[PDB]
Design a binder for this molecule. Structure first.
Ligand SMILES: [Xe]
Ligand SMILES: [Xe]
Ligand SMILES: [Xe]
Length: 254
């Protein structure tokens, strides 16, 4: 019925709060962890080569920054991702699988595989109900990565990463000047609000958690624990884009 357009160029922002390690304390006497820090997650998406009649490539740059700092300070996380997807299905075709940044046209009330770029694997995005978003009826989907159905930490992803520091520097118990090596782990939970016609994700809520531990289910030191939601302006921009796409599709479909 339709193809993902080749002229997508969006910059979306999600605001929220985090507990975060201060990267500027890496060589300090004690690793500094700041609580209840305001943050902004910015996602910039642009179309790149290869894109043609069949496929579309998106380059996505994502940053998480503290908003109680000026522009040269407070960068917490940065990720660049590149994916080529089928223009008709939105499915991925470094190797990605399933949905990544959009749902298919005529999205159904069912489970979809949705890629997590840190886990480097697709996890179920389960249908969770209908909800109005700025006058548009959307389908809500929920994806858990490392958390079970009850929201308990169960299978966090171990990064392939490790950090070695004295117990006094980590701020954990230990023998005097004991050297401790901890692995980095990741777990996340996301909610997507989807326009069922165009498949556009008009709003998202994301709760990301990265920490250091000797054992996966016994987190010891937080790297980042953030919860963000797409801001009003970004939701309005996506609802407008989805609405334009829907108006165009309505002209040649039944
Ligand atoms: Xe990020
Ligand atoms: Xe660290
Ligand atoms: Xe850390």
């Amino acid at each position: 019925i339709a193809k993902i357009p080749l002229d997508i160029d969006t910059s979306l922002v999600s605001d929220g709060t985090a507990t975060a390690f201060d990267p500027d304390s890496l060589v300090a006497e004690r690793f500094k962890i700041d609580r209840d820090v305001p943050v902004a997650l910015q996602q910039q998406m642009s179309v790149e080569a290869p894109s043609n009649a069949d496929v579309v490539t998106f380059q996505v740059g994502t940053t998480l920054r503290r908003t109680d700092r000026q522009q040269d300070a407070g960068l917490l996380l940065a990720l660049v991702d590149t994916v080529t997807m089928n223009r008709n299905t939105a499915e991925a075709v470094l190797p990605h699988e399933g949905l990544t940044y959009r749902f298919p046209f005529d999205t159904e009330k069912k489970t979809y595989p949705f890629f997590d770029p840190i886990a480097q694997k697709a996890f179920d995005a389960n249908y969770d109900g209908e909800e109005d978003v700025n006058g548009l009826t959307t389908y809500r989907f929920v994806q858990n990565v490392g958390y079970d159905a009850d929201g308990k930490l169960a299978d966090p992803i171990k990064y392939s990463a490790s950090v070695t520091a004295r117990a006094e520097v980590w701020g954990v118990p230990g023998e005097p000047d004991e050297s401790i090596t901890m692995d980095r782990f990741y777990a996340a939970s996301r909610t997507f609000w989807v326009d069922p016609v165009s498949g556009t994700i008009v709003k998202s809520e994301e709760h990301g958690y990265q920490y250091y531990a000797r054992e996966a289910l016994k987190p010891e030191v937080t790297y980042v624990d953030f919860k963000v939601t797409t801001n009003e302006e970004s939701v309005e921009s996506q609802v407008a884009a989805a609405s334009d796409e829907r108006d165009r599709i309505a002209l040649w479909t039944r």
